[PDB]
Amino acid sequence: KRAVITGLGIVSSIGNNQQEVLASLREGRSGITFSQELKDSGMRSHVWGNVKLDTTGLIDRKVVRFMSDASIYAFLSMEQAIADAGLSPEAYQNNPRVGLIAGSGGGSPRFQVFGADAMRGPRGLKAVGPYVVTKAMASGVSACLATPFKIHGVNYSISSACATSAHCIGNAVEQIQLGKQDIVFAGGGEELCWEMACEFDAMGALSTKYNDTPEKASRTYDAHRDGFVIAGGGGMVVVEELEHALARGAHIYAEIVGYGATSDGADMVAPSGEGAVRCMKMAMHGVDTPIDYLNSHGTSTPVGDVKELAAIREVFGDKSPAISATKAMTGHSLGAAGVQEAIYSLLMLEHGFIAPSINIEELDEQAAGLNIVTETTDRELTTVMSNSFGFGGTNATLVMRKL
Amino acid sequence: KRAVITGLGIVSSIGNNQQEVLASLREGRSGITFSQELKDSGMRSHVWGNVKLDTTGLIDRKVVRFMSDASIYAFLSMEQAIADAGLSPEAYQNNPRVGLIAGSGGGSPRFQVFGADAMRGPRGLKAVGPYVVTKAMASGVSACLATPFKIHGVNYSISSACATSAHCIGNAVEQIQLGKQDIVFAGGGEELCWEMACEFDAMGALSTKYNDTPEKASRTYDAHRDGFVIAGGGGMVVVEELEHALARGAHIYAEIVGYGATSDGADMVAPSGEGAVRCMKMAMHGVDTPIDYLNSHGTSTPVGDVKELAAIREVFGDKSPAISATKAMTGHSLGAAGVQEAIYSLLMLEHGFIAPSINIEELDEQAAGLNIVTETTDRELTTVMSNSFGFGGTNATLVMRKL
CATH class of the missing domain: 3.40.47.10 (Thiolase/Chalcone synthase)
Structure with missing residues (x-):
């Protein structure tokens, strides 16, 4: 089980x-x-x-x-x-x-x-x-x-x-x-x-x-x-x-x-916040420990990036986790993005640190509710979440926790 | 459930x-x-x-x-x-x-x-x-x-x-x-x-x-x-x-x-009997009713066709169901073959008949003691099975029964 x-x-x-x-x-x-x-x-x-x-x-x-x-x-x-x-x-x-x-x-x-x-x-x-x-x-x-x-x-x-x-x-x-x-x-x-x-x-x-x-x-x-x-x-x-x-x-x-898996059933290639919100929430059912770190889908696209932040704001309101988009470092490996990012998340959990969200010269206004870490920070993490929202409105998010 | x-x-x-x-x-x-x-x-x-x-x-x-x-x-x-x-x-x-x-x-x-x-x-x-x-x-x-x-x-x-x-x-x-x-x-x-x-x-x-x-x-x-x-x-x-x-x-x-889903873990493109045998068996676990009709994977290939037969015989023995490969009629639609054939199976269940295995001008030696229906035959079916064994040694079989 x-x-x-x-x-x-x-x-x-x-x-x-x-x-x-x-x-x-x-x-x-x-x-x-x-x-x-x-x-x-x-x-x-x-x-x-x-x-x-x-x-x-x-x-x-x-x-x-x-x-x-x-x-x-x-x-x-x-x-x-x-x-x-x-x-x-x-x-x-x-x-x-x-x-x-x-x-x-x-x-x-x-x-x-x-x-x-x-x-x-x-x-x-x-x-x-x-x-x-x-x-x-x-x-x-x-x-x-x-x-x-x-x-x-x-x-x-x-x-x-x-x-x-x-x-x-x-x-x-x-x-x-x-x-x-x-x-x-x-x-x-x-x-x-x-x-x-x-x-x-x-x-x-x-x-x-x-x-x-x-x-x-x-x-x-x-x-x-x-x-x-x-x-x-x-x-x-x-x-x-x-x-x-x-x-x-x-x-x-x-x-x-x-493990959340939902569908947008709205737009092709474009993400709808609702859908991502349901996905994260579905991943959180039963998980009563806080989310210490969130590895966003954030692919570096104008629309997508702030659409995911908006979803996060809904799911977490004022208890928003530390966030970072490792894609600013690695790029988007598409089909390999899901497991690779889960792996980065697992490594940050194992070695207690948060990878940085690099190349942010001017944080997007729509991102004022911060906690997007732009510097490698050592921290004891316990529960982490990884988001994957692909074209066709197909969403997945995984929540991993230290035993 | x-x-x-x-x-x-x-x-x-x-x-x-x-x-x-x-x-x-x-x-x-x-x-x-x-x-x-x-x-x-x-x-x-x-x-x-x-x-x-x-x-x-x-x-x-x-x-x-x-x-x-x-x-x-x-x-x-x-x-x-x-x-x-x-x-x-x-x-x-x-x-x-x-x-x-x-x-x-x-x-x-x-x-x-x-x-x-x-x-x-x-x-x-x-x-x-x-x-x-x-x-x-x-x-x-x-x-x-x-x-x-x-x-x-x-x-x-x-x-x-x-x-x-x-x-x-x-x-x-x-x-x-x-x-x-x-x-x-x-x-x-x-x-x-x-x-x-x-x-x-x-x-x-x-x-x-x-x-x-x-x-x-x-x-x-x-x-x-x-x-x-x-x-x-x-x-x-x-x-x-x-x-x-x-x-x-x-x-x-x-x-x-x-519902059986197994892997051959042996040969590429070529099918191994055992993997199919486990798949069918996994599909009949818990089904207290005999299989009345089997819709074989049988794609019309020299090796593949007879390997499935041997698998079936290993599975049933002297309990072999009526068999027919509707691919002799339809051809191999690959990715669409699984559901289409499940649909044919469902129609034969719903309408009480067994579709024929056509074009067998000469029965292969391996398909010896078996019920290969080559004529449309009316029959009250209750439980049917459909086999799908694809390249890469990936097997699937479904068992559908009337309520």
Whole structure:
């Protein structure tokens, strides 16, 4: 019935494992860099939240033939999580009580496009090859990790744009509550490419006025923000039943004490405060300890940023928690944003500190009811909340508490 | 706690609604036709499981501008499900206890490719336009239906290849069991295009030897089958909490009394018997009634078809149910296959007949001692089972029973 996180792994723009991420979080270090690729694309946005790591050879030759970047990032993250959780092969492999729920927001635009361009050339089918489905299909991330890691429980992906990996974690918690699984690896991944990025630029969602100073592009809550900074990477956490975790001497980060999942049912791409309010409240049902820190969705967009603050004001009124948007550092990894940010939240809980909300040169007026921390502050945290509100009006929020 | 289907909608290759689909299933009619588009793309497979319908002015300009075919098909299917259920806006809209769980196996390869093609042209961003994300993103089907239908409950998509809409339904059932929702629209959609189809041809998964006689290409269990026939379309069922249904005088087709979801954790694209066996068994746990009819996954592939048989025999033995693969008629709609086939199963339950397993000019040796119904046969059915085993070793099976 109770769900705890007994392990975590992450490959991101500010770190290649939890240690580099930590140091990065405490330092308010940007993972954003200039992109020749995007510029060469014709996009007006030339800033990236790229993973600094040559993934070549990092995965078995026969295994990686099926994967796309999103899958590669999730795989490496899962390798970490397994080691971190102290899970031996005989403890999670060929085990009907061990499952996998991980996905991506966009699958693999790069390999869908690759398949098309190839089919339309002199070589036709021969130039396409037999690995484009597993790479391009929406369930790529889950399909590509379940087979190699020998998962026997649930196996599928959940997608919900900026909230996909958060919904992945919440669903994992439900499997534990339903007594269907003892362990569920939850998370997701996302490739970084002009193929997909141009789509967001086309709808004016990405930053375009700070290409000369990449590290200043992502500026959640700043009066001059102008869209988010796309990014890629992976993340994965080990969701485990309390008793099973205690029974084997597992190290527990936090227990998932709250999980909200609602729908706006109003506007596409644009967020409605109501909806987010219900999501947070739903995550708070039963949680009687205060929320010490809130890791906002805050993607650095004019509308979205102040729409989330407004929701927070409703849910908390005058007891508003310390807030910070780590996206000003990391960028928006879409499908990987949910689990990655849960991981940052878990790290701040474990090491007692609040990561800073960087690049706020002029706090947005609509943000007067402060407590948005713009400086790394050491504090003993007990209960933290992470918000994920994606396109299509799909919301998710998780509440993690120290045991 | 208990979940029932109180409404259904479907847009498929053998019928644009449940009355048309009932006719084709009784008749044993094929929805497969020759495709100029496929042939012209350069594919070796030129057979289609196309949706015979002009959707041109069926969806409001403001709403369909964000959709791709998969979304359009799922939307029309929900519309029918909504009407066939007895539901009106004031009862399903702006209601936190009503949700949506629907997705697709491949999202929209057509619009991902279109964006890339459009970006590379001379106009660039202005040629891509602002609607490619919602069309191409993996969560397109759910995002595109939640907003227009003003959904307030859960809102997200699940992908698992040939099993995505089945997992979508099973997840809907769990939300009811968890007491989180009263009604959950579950299903999915899938576009039909060379862009995606060529990917499956490239891995030799599609039929290629029967292009001259399209209706004979899909021949599950036949000794000369040679891959599946790709198809597209949508499906959607209304999963509802029993007491809620009864209280409003809803029409109940059946109750989902079983839901299995397992993983092979062995081979990519290739199915392992054991995973399926566990899935079916997990689905029949607690069902005190025998399975009267089994709607197999049977996609018409040499390996896959017989592996499922062996799995079934391992499961039942000398208790084998009547079997039939409706894919020999409809083709493989991938992400839409799960709900569509659940719908066929529900119709056979509701109308007391078993749809035929067509095109078996020569029964495969492996399908020996089994009841493969090859003729439309009238029978009073009580409990039916539907199998969905997708690429990546992800399995799902649903057991529906009369109340």
